[PDB]
Amino acid sequence: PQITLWKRPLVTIKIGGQLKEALLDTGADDTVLEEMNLPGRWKPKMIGGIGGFIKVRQYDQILIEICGHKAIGTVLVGPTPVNIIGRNLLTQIGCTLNF
Amino acid sequence: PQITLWKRPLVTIKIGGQLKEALLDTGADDTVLEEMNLPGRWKPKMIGGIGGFIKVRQYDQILIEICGHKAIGTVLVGPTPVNIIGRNLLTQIGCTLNF
Ligand SMILES: Cc1nc(COc2ccc(C[C@H](NC(=O)O[C@H]3CO[C@H]4OCC[C@H]43)[C@H](O)CN(CC(C)C)S(=O)(=O)c3ccc([C@H](C)O)cc3)cc2)cs1
């Protein structure tokens, strides 16, 4: 679809069998999701933005469905205030910026 | 134009008569630039990011050119890791997300 930016570009996603709301975020290289106890192996990472860094757990090859568009790749899990879909997955669903 | 997301959506902006590079950031409500001199009055404000809250200088009704497209709006100046163009200005230039 077409998403205007009057409000936060929040959409419904499906990850690890759960539905959540997440931001389609062109300013994020990678995807960061709220704390969730996903199965499988992970590696610790620290990621930074405004206000400093948070610790996250990096899971590879995770399936996420975004408004019906399936994607698979790296997700970082930790205490983010918001679920963030970054460019690693936006590219996979064919998402572009247009003006 | 149509901007794909395989790379960071960096653009040249014009503000205060000076050219800078900035990130088109749909996950940002607000536009936040790195420490720079800007003319006019400003008020102290706080903003929160992934890592916590920072002190910024809020400049209202500032002229800013984004890839030629003119915007006049609020610009926050402070210790952001990256110059980000947020939705307050992306809406002005007619930016949408599409997939
Ligand atoms: C109840 C509460 N809500 C909050 C605020 O919650 C939010 C809401 C949205 C965001 C998204 C964030 N936007 C943002 O900082 O925007 C601020 C300016 O406008 C306001 O509007 C929202 C906040 C304010 C960017 O879009 C994306 N970022 C990078 C850019 C800075 C370069 S990143 O997230 O740092 C990040 C870093 C690394 C990676 C991987 C490793 O690549 C992925 C993402 C973050 C926190 C606090 S408390």
PDB file of C-alpha atoms and ligand atoms in Angstrom:
ATOM      1  CA  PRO A   1       0.000   0.000   0.000  1.00  0.00           C
ATOM      2  CA  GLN A   2       0.872   3.701   0.362  1.00  0.00           C
ATOM      3  CA  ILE A   3       1.704   4.941   3.872  1.00  0.00           C
ATOM      4  CA  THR A   4       1.585   8.664   4.554  1.00  0.00           C
ATOM      5  CA  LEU A   5       3.715  10.151   7.306  1.00  0.00           C
ATOM      6  CA  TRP A   6       1.096  12.369   9.068  1.00  0.00           C
ATOM      7  CA  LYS A   7       1.344   9.801  11.929  1.00  0.00           C
ATOM      8  CA  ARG A   8       3.963   7.144  12.897  1.00  0.00           C
ATOM      9  CA  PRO A   9       4.128   4.497  10.078  1.00  0.00           C
ATOM     10  CA  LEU A  10       2.985   1.715  12.377  1.00  0.00           C
ATOM     11  CA  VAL A  11       1.979  -1.595  10.811  1.00  0.00           C
ATOM     12  CA  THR A  12       1.086  -5.092  12.014  1.00  0.00           C
ATOM     13  CA  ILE A  13       3.865  -7.741  11.842  1.00  0.00           C
ATOM     14  CA  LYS A  14       3.987 -11.501  12.666  1.00  0.00           C
ATOM     15  CA  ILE A  15       7.292 -12.804  14.253  1.00  0.00           C
ATOM     16  CA  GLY A  16       7.857 -16.098  16.200  1.00  0.00           C
ATOM     17  CA  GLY A  17       4.110 -16.806  15.985  1.00  0.00           C
ATOM     18  CA  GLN A  18       3.093 -13.473  17.553  1.00  0.00           C
ATOM     19  CA  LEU A  19       1.436 -10.329  16.187  1.00  0.00           C
ATOM     20  CA  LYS A  20       2.903  -6.934  17.104  1.00  0.00           C
ATOM     21  CA  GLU A  21       2.885  -3.306  15.960  1.00  0.00           C
ATOM     22  CA  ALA A  22       6.133  -1.983  14.491  1.00  0.00           C
ATOM     23  CA  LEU A  23       7.495   1.127  12.765  1.00  0.00           C
ATOM     24  CA  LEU A  24       8.558   1.040   9.114  1.00  0.00           C
ATOM     25  CA  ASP A  25      11.803   2.910   9.695  1.00  0.00           C
ATOM     26  CA  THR A  26      14.001   4.049   6.810  1.00  0.00           C
ATOM     27  CA  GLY A  27      16.407   5.507   9.368  1.00  0.00           C
ATOM     28  CA  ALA A  28      17.212   2.049  10.805  1.00  0.00           C
ATOM     29  CA  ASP A  29      19.839  -0.113   9.072  1.00  0.00           C
ATOM     30  CA  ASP A  30      18.569  -3.186  10.951  1.00  0.00           C
ATOM     31  CA  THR A  31      15.462  -4.393  12.727  1.00  0.00           C
ATOM     32  CA  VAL A  32      15.020  -4.053  16.466  1.00  0.00           C
ATOM     33  CA  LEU A  33      12.170  -5.684  18.357  1.00  0.00           C
ATOM     34  CA  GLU A  34      10.878  -5.523  21.921  1.00  0.00           C
ATOM     35  CA  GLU A  35      12.111  -8.126  24.398  1.00  0.00           C
ATOM     36  CA  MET A  36      10.778 -11.545  23.404  1.00  0.00           C
ATOM     37  CA  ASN A  37      12.014 -15.063  24.331  1.00  0.00           C
ATOM     38  CA  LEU A  38      12.696 -16.368  20.791  1.00  0.00           C
ATOM     39  CA  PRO A  39      14.197 -19.877  20.451  1.00  0.00           C
ATOM     40  CA  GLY A  40      17.586 -20.538  18.922  1.00  0.00           C
ATOM     41  CA  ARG A  41      21.107 -19.219  19.069  1.00  0.00           C
ATOM     42  CA  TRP A  42      21.917 -15.538  19.416  1.00  0.00           C
ATOM     43  CA  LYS A  43      24.874 -13.187  19.874  1.00  0.00           C
ATOM     44  CA  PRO A  44      25.007 -10.107  22.141  1.00  0.00           C
ATOM     45  CA  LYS A  45      25.351  -6.706  20.494  1.00  0.00           C
ATOM     46  CA  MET A  46      25.166  -3.049  21.518  1.00  0.00           C
ATOM     47  CA  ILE A  47      23.309  -0.604  19.261  1.00  0.00           C
ATOM     48  CA  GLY A  48      23.169   3.156  19.515  1.00  0.00           C
ATOM     49  CA  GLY A  49      21.050   6.122  18.695  1.00  0.00           C
ATOM     50  CA  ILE A  50      19.735   9.230  20.362  1.00  0.00           C
ATOM     51  CA  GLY A  51      20.375   8.915  24.060  1.00  0.00           C
ATOM     52  CA  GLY A  52      23.087   6.260  23.832  1.00  0.00           C
ATOM     53  CA  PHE A  53      23.252   2.476  23.559  1.00  0.00           C
ATOM     54  CA  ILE A  54      21.145  -0.514  24.531  1.00  0.00           C
ATOM     55  CA  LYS A  55      22.171  -4.150  24.688  1.00  0.00           C
ATOM     56  CA  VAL A  56      20.363  -6.500  22.340  1.00  0.00           C
ATOM     57  CA  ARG A  57      20.442 -10.140  21.277  1.00  0.00           C
ATOM     58  CA  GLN A  58      20.997 -10.733  17.564  1.00  0.00           C
ATOM     59  CA  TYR A  59      19.019 -13.581  16.001  1.00  0.00           C
ATOM     60  CA  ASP A  60      19.752 -14.528  12.401  1.00  0.00           C
ATOM     61  CA  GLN A  61      17.371 -15.804   9.695  1.00  0.00           C
ATOM     62  CA  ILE A  62      14.128 -14.920  11.481  1.00  0.00           C
ATOM     63  CA  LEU A  63      10.866 -14.897   9.535  1.00  0.00           C
ATOM     64  CA  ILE A  64       8.738 -11.767   9.801  1.00  0.00           C
ATOM     65  CA  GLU A  65       5.551 -11.037   7.886  1.00  0.00           C
ATOM     66  CA  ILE A  66       4.836  -7.330   7.335  1.00  0.00           C
ATOM     67  CA  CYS A  67       1.322  -6.466   6.102  1.00  0.00           C
ATOM     68  CA  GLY A  68       1.266  -9.840   4.388  1.00  0.00           C
ATOM     69  CA  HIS A  69       4.735  -9.479   2.856  1.00  0.00           C
ATOM     70  CA  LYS A  70       7.091 -12.198   4.105  1.00  0.00           C
ATOM     71  CA  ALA A  71      10.700 -11.308   4.948  1.00  0.00           C
ATOM     72  CA  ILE A  72      13.551 -13.224   6.571  1.00  0.00           C
ATOM     73  CA  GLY A  73      16.721 -11.910   8.127  1.00  0.00           C
ATOM     74  CA  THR A  74      18.440 -10.570  11.189  1.00  0.00           C
ATOM     75  CA  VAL A  75      16.443  -9.263  14.154  1.00  0.00           C
ATOM     76  CA  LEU A  76      17.887  -7.590  17.247  1.00  0.00           C
ATOM     77  CA  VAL A  77      15.897  -8.175  20.457  1.00  0.00           C
ATOM     78  CA  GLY A  78      16.134  -6.038  23.548  1.00  0.00           C
ATOM     79  CA  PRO A  79      14.680  -3.158  25.550  1.00  0.00           C
ATOM     80  CA  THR A  80      13.753  -0.860  22.690  1.00  0.00           C
ATOM     81  CA  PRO A  81      10.828   1.479  23.417  1.00  0.00           C
ATOM     82  CA  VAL A  82       9.309   0.568  20.007  1.00  0.00           C
ATOM     83  CA  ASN A  83       9.416  -2.224  17.445  1.00  0.00           C
ATOM     84  CA  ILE A  84      11.513  -1.015  14.508  1.00  0.00           C
ATOM     85  CA  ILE A  85      11.504  -2.578  11.040  1.00  0.00           C
ATOM     86  CA  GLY A  86      14.767  -1.497   9.416  1.00  0.00           C
ATOM     87  CA  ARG A  87      16.150  -1.507   5.894  1.00  0.00           C
ATOM     88  CA  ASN A  88      17.375  -5.112   6.111  1.00  0.00           C
ATOM     89  CA  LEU A  89      13.707  -6.167   5.943  1.00  0.00           C
ATOM     90  CA  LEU A  90      12.139  -3.172   4.202  1.00  0.00           C
ATOM     91  CA  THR A  91      14.167  -3.964   1.079  1.00  0.00           C
ATOM     92  CA  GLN A  92      12.760  -7.504   1.079  1.00  0.00           C
ATOM     93  CA  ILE A  93       9.145  -6.320   0.987  1.00  0.00           C
ATOM     94  CA  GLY A  94       9.817  -3.858  -1.830  1.00  0.00           C
ATOM     95  CA  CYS A  95       9.474  -0.716   0.292  1.00  0.00           C
ATOM     96  CA  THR A  96      10.514   2.626  -1.204  1.00  0.00           C
ATOM     97  CA  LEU A  97      10.423   6.287  -0.213  1.00  0.00           C
ATOM     98  CA  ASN A  98       8.653   8.515  -2.745  1.00  0.00           C
ATOM     99  CA  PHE A  99       8.372  12.321  -2.974  1.00  0.00           C
TER     100      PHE A  99
ATOM    101  CA  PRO B   1      12.165  10.674  -6.829  1.00  0.00           C
ATOM    102  CA  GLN B   2      11.765   7.014  -5.854  1.00  0.00           C
ATOM    103  CA  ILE B   3      14.330   6.004  -3.236  1.00  0.00           C
ATOM    104  CA  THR B   4      15.110   2.341  -2.643  1.00  0.00           C
ATOM    105  CA  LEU B   5      16.484   1.235   0.716  1.00  0.00           C
ATOM    106  CA  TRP B   6      19.476  -1.007  -0.123  1.00  0.00           C
ATOM    107  CA  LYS B   7      21.584   1.908   1.084  1.00  0.00           C
ATOM    108  CA  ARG B   8      20.935   4.558   3.713  1.00  0.00           C
ATOM    109  CA  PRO B   9      18.598   7.244   2.269  1.00  0.00           C
ATOM    110  CA  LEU B  10      21.104  10.062   2.709  1.00  0.00           C
ATOM    111  CA  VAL B  11      20.365  13.378   1.013  1.00  0.00           C
ATOM    112  CA  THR B  12      21.949  16.796   0.825  1.00  0.00           C
ATOM    113  CA  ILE B  13      20.060  19.465   2.732  1.00  0.00           C
ATOM    114  CA  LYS B  14      20.459  23.251   2.755  1.00  0.00           C
ATOM    115  CA  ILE B  15      19.961  25.013   6.083  1.00  0.00           C
ATOM    116  CA  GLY B  16      21.245  28.344   7.329  1.00  0.00           C
ATOM    117  CA  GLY B  17      22.856  28.771   3.915  1.00  0.00           C
ATOM    118  CA  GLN B  18      25.057  25.694   4.392  1.00  0.00           C
ATOM    119  CA  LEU B  19      24.908  22.272   2.751  1.00  0.00           C
ATOM    120  CA  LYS B  20      24.869  19.155   4.940  1.00  0.00           C
ATOM    121  CA  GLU B  21      24.161  15.436   4.615  1.00  0.00           C
ATOM    122  CA  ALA B  22      21.127  13.996   6.422  1.00  0.00           C
ATOM    123  CA  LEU B  23      19.161  10.753   6.706  1.00  0.00           C
ATOM    124  CA  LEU B  24      15.532  10.492   5.617  1.00  0.00           C
ATOM    125  CA  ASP B  25      14.118   8.852   8.772  1.00  0.00           C
ATOM    126  CA  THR B  26      10.486   7.741   8.803  1.00  0.00           C
ATOM    127  CA  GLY B  27      10.991   6.420  12.390  1.00  0.00           C
ATOM    128  CA  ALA B  28      11.637   9.936  13.617  1.00  0.00           C
ATOM    129  CA  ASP B  29       8.779  12.253  14.597  1.00  0.00           C
ATOM    130  CA  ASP B  30      11.171  15.178  14.651  1.00  0.00           C
ATOM    131  CA  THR B  31      14.137  16.497  12.712  1.00  0.00           C
ATOM    132  CA  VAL B  32      17.358  16.459  14.730  1.00  0.00           C
ATOM    133  CA  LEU B  33      20.722  17.763  13.469  1.00  0.00           C
ATOM    134  CA  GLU B  34      24.245  17.574  15.024  1.00  0.00           C
ATOM    135  CA  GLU B  35      25.700  20.613  16.936  1.00  0.00           C
ATOM    136  CA  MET B  36      25.761  23.586  14.519  1.00  0.00           C
ATOM    137  CA  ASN B  37      25.287  27.350  14.605  1.00  0.00           C
ATOM    138  CA  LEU B  38      21.823  28.445  13.519  1.00  0.00           C
ATOM    139  CA  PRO B  39      20.405  31.981  13.505  1.00  0.00           C
ATOM    140  CA  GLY B  40      17.380  32.897  15.556  1.00  0.00           C
ATOM    141  CA  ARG B  41      15.861  32.280  18.940  1.00  0.00           C
ATOM    142  CA  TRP B  42      15.594  28.780  20.384  1.00  0.00           C
ATOM    143  CA  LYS B  43      14.205  27.129  23.498  1.00  0.00           C
ATOM    144  CA  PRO B  44      15.577  24.161  25.470  1.00  0.00           C
ATOM    145  CA  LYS B  45      13.739  20.912  24.814  1.00  0.00           C
ATOM    146  CA  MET B  46      14.149  17.212  25.574  1.00  0.00           C
ATOM    147  CA  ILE B  47      13.746  14.335  23.133  1.00  0.00           C
ATOM    148  CA  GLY B  48      13.946  10.577  23.595  1.00  0.00           C
ATOM    149  CA  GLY B  49      15.531   8.044  21.314  1.00  0.00           C
ATOM    150  CA  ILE B  50      16.375   4.366  21.454  1.00  0.00           C
ATOM    151  CA  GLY B  51      18.973   5.000  24.171  1.00  0.00           C
ATOM    152  CA  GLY B  52      17.273   7.581  26.345  1.00  0.00           C
ATOM    153  CA  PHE B  53      16.623  11.304  26.450  1.00  0.00           C
ATOM    154  CA  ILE B  54      18.880  14.184  25.405  1.00  0.00           C
ATOM    155  CA  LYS B  55      18.830  17.972  25.738  1.00  0.00           C
ATOM    156  CA  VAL B  56      18.348  19.824  22.428  1.00  0.00           C
ATOM    157  CA  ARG B  57      17.939  23.370  21.146  1.00  0.00           C
ATOM    158  CA  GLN B  58      14.559  23.836  19.438  1.00  0.00           C
ATOM    159  CA  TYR B  59      14.473  26.257  16.488  1.00  0.00           C
ATOM    160  CA  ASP B  60      10.989  26.909  15.115  1.00  0.00           C
ATOM    161  CA  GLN B  61       9.969  27.935  11.595  1.00  0.00           C
ATOM    162  CA  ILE B  62      13.376  27.288  10.041  1.00  0.00           C
ATOM    163  CA  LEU B  63      13.799  27.188   6.290  1.00  0.00           C
ATOM    164  CA  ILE B  64      15.374  23.952   5.113  1.00  0.00           C
ATOM    165  CA  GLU B  65      15.847  22.608   1.543  1.00  0.00           C
ATOM    166  CA  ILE B  66      15.810  18.792   1.137  1.00  0.00           C
ATOM    167  CA  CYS B  67      16.920  17.668  -2.323  1.00  0.00           C
ATOM    168  CA  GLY B  68      15.538  20.924  -3.647  1.00  0.00           C
ATOM    169  CA  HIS B  69      12.149  20.601  -1.929  1.00  0.00           C
ATOM    170  CA  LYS B  70      11.517  23.479   0.479  1.00  0.00           C
ATOM    171  CA  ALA B  71      10.297  22.967   4.031  1.00  0.00           C
ATOM    172  CA  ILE B  72       9.796  25.453   6.847  1.00  0.00           C
ATOM    173  CA  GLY B  73       9.598  23.874  10.255  1.00  0.00           C
ATOM    174  CA  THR B  74      11.025  22.893  13.581  1.00  0.00           C
ATOM    175  CA  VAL B  75      14.657  21.780  13.706  1.00  0.00           C
ATOM    176  CA  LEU B  76      16.157  20.303  16.877  1.00  0.00           C
ATOM    177  CA  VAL B  77      19.896  20.707  17.355  1.00  0.00           C
ATOM    178  CA  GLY B  78      21.912  18.530  19.692  1.00  0.00           C
ATOM    179  CA  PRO B  79      23.943  15.355  20.268  1.00  0.00           C
ATOM    180  CA  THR B  80      22.248  13.076  17.756  1.00  0.00           C
ATOM    181  CA  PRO B  81      24.627  10.481  16.259  1.00  0.00           C
ATOM    182  CA  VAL B  82      23.272  11.284  12.770  1.00  0.00           C
ATOM    183  CA  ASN B  83      21.539  14.213  11.078  1.00  0.00           C
ATOM    184  CA  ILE B  84      17.969  12.949  10.686  1.00  0.00           C
ATOM    185  CA  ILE B  85      15.053  14.372   8.705  1.00  0.00           C
ATOM    186  CA  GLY B  86      11.889  13.359  10.527  1.00  0.00           C
ATOM    187  CA  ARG B  87       8.210  13.268   9.695  1.00  0.00           C
ATOM    188  CA  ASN B  88       7.592  16.927  10.572  1.00  0.00           C
ATOM    189  CA  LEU B  89       9.564  17.795   7.417  1.00  0.00           C
ATOM    190  CA  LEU B  90       9.063  14.630   5.365  1.00  0.00           C
ATOM    191  CA  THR B  91       5.344  15.417   5.251  1.00  0.00           C
ATOM    192  CA  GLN B  92       6.113  18.922   3.976  1.00  0.00           C
ATOM    193  CA  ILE B  93       7.975  17.569   0.974  1.00  0.00           C
ATOM    194  CA  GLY B  94       5.285  15.020   0.202  1.00  0.00           C
ATOM    195  CA  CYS B  95       7.180  11.908   1.194  1.00  0.00           C
ATOM    196  CA  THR B  96       5.296   8.607   1.462  1.00  0.00           C
ATOM    197  CA  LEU B  97       6.293   4.982   1.977  1.00  0.00           C
ATOM    198  CA  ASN B  98       5.209   2.499  -0.662  1.00  0.00           C
ATOM    199  CA  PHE B  99       5.256  -1.265  -1.095  1.00  0.00           C
TER     200      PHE B  99
HETATM  201  C1  LIG C   1       7.639   5.948  25.658  1.00  0.00           C
HETATM  202  C2  LIG C   1       8.942   6.348  24.941  1.00  0.00           C
HETATM  203  N1  LIG C   1       9.110   6.510  23.525  1.00  0.00           N
HETATM  204  C3  LIG C   1      10.581   6.933  23.246  1.00  0.00           C
HETATM  205  C4  LIG C   1      11.210   7.199  21.845  1.00  0.00           C
HETATM  206  O1  LIG C   1      11.134   5.935  21.210  1.00  0.00           O
HETATM  207  C5  LIG C   1      11.681   5.762  19.924  1.00  0.00           C
HETATM  208  C6  LIG C   1      10.807   5.962  18.684  1.00  0.00           C
HETATM  209  C7  LIG C   1      11.417   5.736  17.299  1.00  0.00           C
HETATM  210  C8  LIG C   1      12.907   5.307  17.192  1.00  0.00           C
HETATM  211  C9  LIG C   1      13.559   5.090  15.803  1.00  0.00           C
HETATM  212  C10 LIG C   1      14.609   6.178  15.589  1.00  0.00           C
HETATM  213  N2  LIG C   1      13.913   7.441  15.705  1.00  0.00           N
HETATM  214  C11 LIG C   1      14.334   8.557  16.615  1.00  0.00           C
HETATM  215  O2  LIG C   1      15.273   8.495  17.379  1.00  0.00           O
HETATM  216  O3  LIG C   1      13.504   9.724  16.536  1.00  0.00           O
HETATM  217  C12 LIG C   1      13.633  10.659  17.635  1.00  0.00           C
HETATM  218  C13 LIG C   1      13.579  12.034  16.823  1.00  0.00           C
HETATM  219  O4  LIG C   1      11.995  12.122  16.609  1.00  0.00           O
HETATM  220  C14 LIG C   1      11.398  11.537  17.701  1.00  0.00           C
HETATM  221  O5  LIG C   1      10.459  10.679  17.399  1.00  0.00           O
HETATM  222  C15 LIG C   1      10.946   9.177  17.756  1.00  0.00           C
HETATM  223  C16 LIG C   1      12.134   9.384  18.724  1.00  0.00           C
HETATM  224  C17 LIG C   1      12.565  10.649  18.495  1.00  0.00           C
HETATM  225  C18 LIG C   1      15.196   6.125  14.155  1.00  0.00           C
HETATM  226  O6  LIG C   1      14.141   6.153  13.266  1.00  0.00           O
HETATM  227  C19 LIG C   1      16.050   4.876  14.034  1.00  0.00           C
HETATM  228  N3  LIG C   1      17.339   5.142  14.820  1.00  0.00           N
HETATM  229  C20 LIG C   1      18.625   5.440  14.127  1.00  0.00           C
HETATM  230  C21 LIG C   1      18.703   6.981  13.812  1.00  0.00           C
HETATM  231  C22 LIG C   1      18.727   7.841  15.053  1.00  0.00           C
HETATM  232  C23 LIG C   1      19.992   7.232  12.950  1.00  0.00           C
HETATM  233  S1  LIG C   1      17.502   4.153  16.214  1.00  0.00           S
HETATM  234  O7  LIG C   1      16.180   3.785  16.732  1.00  0.00           O
HETATM  235  O8  LIG C   1      18.393   4.824  17.150  1.00  0.00           O
HETATM  236  C24 LIG C   1      18.335   2.684  15.632  1.00  0.00           C
HETATM  237  C25 LIG C   1      19.800   2.508  15.890  1.00  0.00           C
HETATM  238  C26 LIG C   1      20.443   1.257  15.367  1.00  0.00           C
HETATM  239  C27 LIG C   1      19.597   0.218  14.623  1.00  0.00           C
HETATM  240  C28 LIG C   1      20.316  -1.060  14.065  1.00  0.00           C
HETATM  241  C29 LIG C   1      21.474  -1.440  14.966  1.00  0.00           C
HETATM  242  O9  LIG C   1      20.697  -0.607  12.818  1.00  0.00           O
HETATM  243  C30 LIG C   1      18.139   0.439  14.357  1.00  0.00           C
HETATM  244  C31 LIG C   1      17.490   1.686  14.867  1.00  0.00           C
HETATM  245  C32 LIG C   1      13.763   5.093  18.449  1.00  0.00           C
HETATM  246  C33 LIG C   1      13.168   5.323  19.812  1.00  0.00           C
HETATM  247  C34 LIG C   1      11.272   6.996  24.505  1.00  0.00           C
HETATM  248  S2  LIG C   1      10.279   6.643  25.602  1.00  0.00           S
END
